[PDB]
Design a protein around this motif. Sequence first.
Motif, PDB file in Angstrom:
ATOM      1  N   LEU A 143       0.835  -1.191   0.000  1.00 13.99           N
ATOM      2  CA  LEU A 143       0.000   0.000   0.000  1.00 13.99           C
ATOM      3  C   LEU A 143       0.874   1.246   0.000  1.00 13.99           C
ATOM      4  CD1 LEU A 143      -2.710  -1.202   2.512  1.00 13.99           C
ATOM      5  CD2 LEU A 143      -3.142  -0.495   0.162  1.00 13.99           C
ATOM      6  N   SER A 144       0.363   2.303  -0.626  1.00 15.35           N
ATOM      7  CA  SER A 144       1.067   3.577  -0.642  1.00 15.35           C
ATOM      8  C   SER A 144       0.051   4.705  -0.595  1.00 15.35           C
ATOM      9  CB  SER A 144       1.951   3.709  -1.885  1.00 15.35           C
ATOM     10  OG  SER A 144       1.177   3.961  -3.039  1.00 15.35           O
ATOM     11  N   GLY A 145       0.182   5.565   0.410  1.00 19.21           N
ATOM     12  CA  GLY A 145      -0.639   6.755   0.540  1.00 19.21           C
ATOM     13  C   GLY A 145       0.145   7.977   0.091  1.00 19.21           C
ATOM     14  N   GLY A 146      -0.473   8.764  -0.785  1.00 17.66           N
ATOM     15  CA  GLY A 146       0.149   9.948  -1.330  1.00 17.66           C
ATOM     16  C   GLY A 146      -0.362  11.217  -0.682  1.00 17.66           C
ATOM     17  N   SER A 147       0.378  12.305  -0.901  1.00 20.97           N
ATOM     18  CA  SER A 147      -0.050  13.597  -0.384  1.00 20.97           C
ATOM     19  C   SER A 147      -1.297  14.116  -1.089  1.00 20.97           C
ATOM     20  CB  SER A 147       1.080  14.616  -0.505  1.00 20.97           C
ATOM     21  OG  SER A 147       1.683  14.567  -1.782  1.00 20.97           O
ATOM     22  N   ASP A 148      -1.660  13.538  -2.232  1.00 19.46           N
ATOM     23  CA  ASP A 148      -2.875  13.918  -2.939  1.00 19.46           C
ATOM     24  C   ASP A 148      -4.104  13.160  -2.455  1.00 19.46           C
ATOM     25  OD1 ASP A 148      -1.444  11.680  -4.368  1.00 19.46           O
ATOM     26  OD2 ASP A 148      -3.306  11.683  -5.526  1.00 19.46           O
ATOM     27  N   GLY A 149      -3.966  12.307  -1.439  1.00 19.53           N
ATOM     28  CA  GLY A 149      -5.093  11.636  -0.832  1.00 19.53           C
ATOM     29  C   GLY A 149      -5.440  10.284  -1.416  1.00 19.53           C
ATOM     30  N   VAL A 150      -4.815   9.885  -2.513  1.00 24.97           N
ATOM     31  CA  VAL A 150      -5.112   8.604  -3.143  1.00 24.97           C
ATOM     32  C   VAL A 150      -4.310   7.515  -2.451  1.00 24.97           C
ATOM     33  CG1 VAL A 150      -5.616   9.742  -5.339  1.00 24.97           C
ATOM     34  CG2 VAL A 150      -3.325   8.773  -4.925  1.00 24.97           C
ATOM     35  N   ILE A 151      -4.828   6.290  -2.506  1.00 26.34           N
ATOM     36  CA  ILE A 151      -4.165   5.117  -1.940  1.00 26.34           C
ATOM     37  C   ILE A 151      -4.004   4.092  -3.050  1.00 26.34           C
ATOM     38  CG2 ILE A 151      -4.266   3.265  -0.244  1.00 26.34           C
ATOM     39  CD1 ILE A 151      -6.108   5.156   1.433  1.00 26.34           C
ATOM     40  N   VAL A 152      -2.768   3.706  -3.341  1.00 30.40           N
ATOM     41  CA  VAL A 152      -2.475   2.786  -4.434  1.00 30.40           C
ATOM     42  C   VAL A 152      -2.025   1.456  -3.851  1.00 30.40           C
ATOM     43  CG1 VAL A 152      -1.201   2.412  -6.567  1.00 30.40           C
ATOM     44  CG2 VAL A 152      -1.846   4.720  -5.904  1.00 30.40           C
ATOM     45  N   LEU A 153      -2.530   0.366  -4.430  1.00 30.99           N
ATOM     46  CA  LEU A 153      -2.223  -0.998  -4.019  1.00 30.99           C
ATOM     47  C   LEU A 153      -1.471  -1.664  -5.162  1.00 30.99           C
ATOM     48  CD1 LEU A 153      -4.800  -3.415  -2.362  1.00 30.99           C
ATOM     49  CD2 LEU A 153      -2.671  -4.126  -3.452  1.00 30.99           C
ATOM     50  N   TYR A 154      -0.195  -1.966  -4.918  1.00 32.81           N
ATOM     51  CA  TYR A 154       0.731  -2.542  -5.881  1.00 32.81           C
ATOM     52  C   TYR A 154       0.946  -4.025  -5.617  1.00 32.81           C
ATOM     53  CZ  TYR A 154       2.178   2.303  -6.783  1.00 32.81           C
ATOM     54  OH  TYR A 154       2.206   3.641  -7.095  1.00 32.81           O
ATOM     55  N   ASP A 155       1.230  -4.758  -6.690  1.00 33.88           N
ATOM     56  CA  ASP A 155       1.720  -6.130  -6.632  1.00 33.88           C
ATOM     57  C   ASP A 155       3.219  -6.112  -6.893  1.00 33.88           C
ATOM     58  OD1 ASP A 155       1.895  -8.892  -6.509  1.00 33.88           O
ATOM     59  OD2 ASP A 155       1.322  -9.170  -8.604  1.00 33.88           O
ATOM     60  N   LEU A 156       3.999  -6.562  -5.915  1.00 37.07           N
ATOM     61  CA  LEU A 156       5.452  -6.532  -6.002  1.00 37.07           C
ATOM     62  C   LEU A 156       6.040  -7.754  -6.695  1.00 37.07           C
ATOM     63  CD1 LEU A 156       6.307  -5.226  -2.417  1.00 37.07           C
ATOM     64  CD2 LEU A 156       6.123  -3.896  -4.528  1.00 37.07           C
ATOM     65  N   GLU A 157       5.247  -8.793  -6.938  1.00 39.18           N
ATOM     66  CA  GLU A 157       5.748 -10.018  -7.540  1.00 39.18           C
ATOM     67  C   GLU A 157       5.952  -9.836  -9.036  1.00 39.18           C
ATOM     68  OE1 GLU A 157       4.219 -13.788  -4.779  1.00 39.18           O
ATOM     69  OE2 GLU A 157       3.434 -13.477  -6.804  1.00 39.18           O
ATOM     70  N   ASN A 158       7.026 -10.430  -9.549  1.00 36.13           N
ATOM     71  CA  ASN A 158       7.357 -10.367 -10.970  1.00 36.13           C
ATOM     72  C   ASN A 158       6.603 -11.477 -11.685  1.00 36.13           C
ATOM     73  OD1 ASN A 158       8.456 -10.026 -13.486  1.00 36.13           O
ATOM     74  ND2 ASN A 158      10.481 -10.815 -12.937  1.00 36.13           N
ATOM     75  N   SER A 159       5.318 -11.243 -11.936  1.00 38.10           N
ATOM     76  CA  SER A 159       4.499 -12.231 -12.623  1.00 38.10           C
ATOM     77  C   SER A 159       4.833 -12.352 -14.103  1.00 38.10           C
ATOM     78  CB  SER A 159       3.019 -11.889 -12.459  1.00 38.10           C
ATOM     79  OG  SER A 159       2.617 -12.028 -11.106  1.00 38.10           O
ATOM     80  N   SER A 160       5.641 -11.450 -14.650  1.00 41.98           N
ATOM     81  CA  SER A 160       6.123 -11.603 -16.011  1.00 41.98           C
ATOM     82  C   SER A 160       7.329 -12.536 -16.035  1.00 41.98           C
ATOM     83  CB  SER A 160       6.495 -10.247 -16.609  1.00 41.98           C
ATOM     84  OG  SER A 160       7.760  -9.816 -16.142  1.00 41.98           O
ATOM     85  N   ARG A 161       7.732 -12.923 -17.244  1.00 44.03           N
ATOM     86  CA  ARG A 161       8.866 -13.823 -17.412  1.00 44.03           C
ATOM     87  C   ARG A 161      10.193 -13.096 -17.575  1.00 44.03           C
ATOM     88  NH1 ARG A 161       5.597 -17.703 -20.293  1.00 44.03           N
ATOM     89  NH2 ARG A 161       4.311 -18.677 -18.667  1.00 44.03           N
ATOM     90  N   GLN A 162      10.184 -11.778 -17.756  1.00 41.82           N
ATOM     91  CA  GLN A 162      11.425 -11.047 -17.959  1.00 41.82           C
ATOM     92  C   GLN A 162      12.131 -10.803 -16.630  1.00 41.82           C
ATOM     93  OE1 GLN A 162       8.610 -10.404 -20.426  1.00 41.82           O
ATOM     94  NE2 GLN A 162      10.158 -11.938 -20.967  1.00 41.82           N
ATOM     95  N   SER A 163      13.427 -10.502 -16.720  1.00 42.39           N
ATOM     96  CA  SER A 163      14.176 -10.070 -15.549  1.00 42.39           C
ATOM     97  C   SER A 163      13.866  -8.631 -15.167  1.00 42.39           C
ATOM     98  CB  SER A 163      15.677 -10.220 -15.797  1.00 42.39           C
ATOM     99  OG  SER A 163      16.115  -9.321 -16.799  1.00 42.39           O
TER     100      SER A 163
END
Lengths: 268, 365
Positions: free
Chosen positions: B60-80
């Motif tokens: 999770l990441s809260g910004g100074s603009d009030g939005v909250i973003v939920l990221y996936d940190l896993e490399n679900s792609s096949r590239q490095s």
Amino acid sequence: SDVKMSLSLPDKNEQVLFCRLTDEQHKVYQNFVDSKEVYRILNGEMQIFSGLIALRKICNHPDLFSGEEDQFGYWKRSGKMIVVESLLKIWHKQGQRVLLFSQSRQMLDILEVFLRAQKYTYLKMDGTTTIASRQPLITRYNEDTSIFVFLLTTRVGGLGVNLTGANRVVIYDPDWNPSTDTQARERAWRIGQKKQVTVYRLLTAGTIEEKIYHRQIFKQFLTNRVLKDPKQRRFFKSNDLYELFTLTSPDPLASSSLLAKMRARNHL
Amino acid sequence: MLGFLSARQTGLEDPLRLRRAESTRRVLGLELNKDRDVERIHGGGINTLDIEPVEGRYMLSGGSDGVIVLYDLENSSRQSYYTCKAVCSIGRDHPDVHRYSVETVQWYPHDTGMFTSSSFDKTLKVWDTNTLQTADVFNFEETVYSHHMSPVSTKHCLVAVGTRGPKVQLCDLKSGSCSHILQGHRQEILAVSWSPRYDYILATASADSRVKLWDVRRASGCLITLDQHNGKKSQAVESANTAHNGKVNGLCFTSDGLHLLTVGTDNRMRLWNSSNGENTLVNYGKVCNNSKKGLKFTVSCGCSSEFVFVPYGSTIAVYTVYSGEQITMLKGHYKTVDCCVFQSNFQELYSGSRDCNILAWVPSL
Ligand SMILES: [Mg+2]
């Protein structure tokens, strides 16, 4: 109720008699509610206390205008005193012991005079009695059954003392605080009460006393709303306004139970 | 390192040895990520980050603009090379978006199905992560500077909230009771942190230059007040026994919960015995901070030596907790760094700063 079955207490009754103002008492009440002082009270000019206390005194007994057998505090001039006379006669012929409460010390003195007028053996304890003798007095009333009636003020006679020797209890005068009356009536129905107890709570019908009973019913409902359950039925008997000056004589949680509870609380 | 593998195979060293030694070596080789990127969605600076405690996948990441973003940190792609894509977003178009900056966001411990976010809009919102709708809202009479849920409590589910009021609020997520407060501070409570070791121990740091440890079950105020000198300058407790010579704007219990790291606006970090609040006199040198709000900094886990990653200007200063020796400066941000969160599974770091960037630091090789 959750302990009564596991404690072997005797039965209880909580009757509420609606007494009737006498002709003289009703006349004094009607004259006061028609007086100029209550008119000034309703206009906000004066404090409400004078009128409230005057009406409570009138309902207790017309000791405002002290009218042989016409001495101060004669029992036949007050309806509640007539009812108390009948109840005391019945209970004495039934060989029972009575616990007679009052909010007012003056009304307690009037009741004491009325009790000496009869042959009843009484025993009094109000705020004036020395504290050192109070527990002795209680023990006396708990020990010998020759003493018939125990006069009390609800502020001293209530509030934690044990009077299981008393069998009947009569609350002569309602209070603004329901809890005063509750503790006064539980002075008898306690651990050690070996006899069936009943509570007779005297109110004058259509007077300030009935309005006080309504105010304290509202207070009791507000208390039950947070002590026993929150589904309490709304108080609908009255709006509880400033028209009690009127005489109207009758005749780890897995974030799903927790989320579900949050949704439940928010949807309310 | 072939020595480490040989010792592990031959049983000379416990596999614990290789694991923690390699974790420490990875943390020491922390560098700007060669092949990793994080999607940019915050229009303003990122004030807070939180990787979920279980499975360490989502951030999770809260910004100074009030939005909250939920990221996936896993490399679900096949590239490095991959970008940490944004799964979800409380954006400006969400009906329940925070009107002002989100200052703390925290995953619910024990389960990833819920998170919480506190804002300077005087609200602590509890969000269902699946539906992405506010399950609850707690309103406060004054702006929230920080909040924290206990990472340990299987019994209680209290959220300790520090606002500009002098009172620490305890909001029960079980049937909603925000009435509980703790008295004893005098200015804004810039940081709050539950002990990872003890269920009911909460450390609170306020602008009155004091840090207090509370047993929230208790009825008698704070347990311990941290004192720089431990008693050398002793006075009747009205204004003495200060943790710092400025505002104490950051707290962090160590991984085991036996020590407490407090960073204050006197350009000092201090390490405290969490059981009696005694200052351990670990130096750390000068730790530059001038943040007027809470400062979010984290400690390493699962390593031979514990590390602490503190925002230091536009950098991340990495220190050894128990010696104070300065490891390094992670230098890749363009403005002051507001938060850094440590992925313990792979010894990774994610730092959010005022430049509207979340930078990932990965061990090299
Ligand atoms: Mg008691």
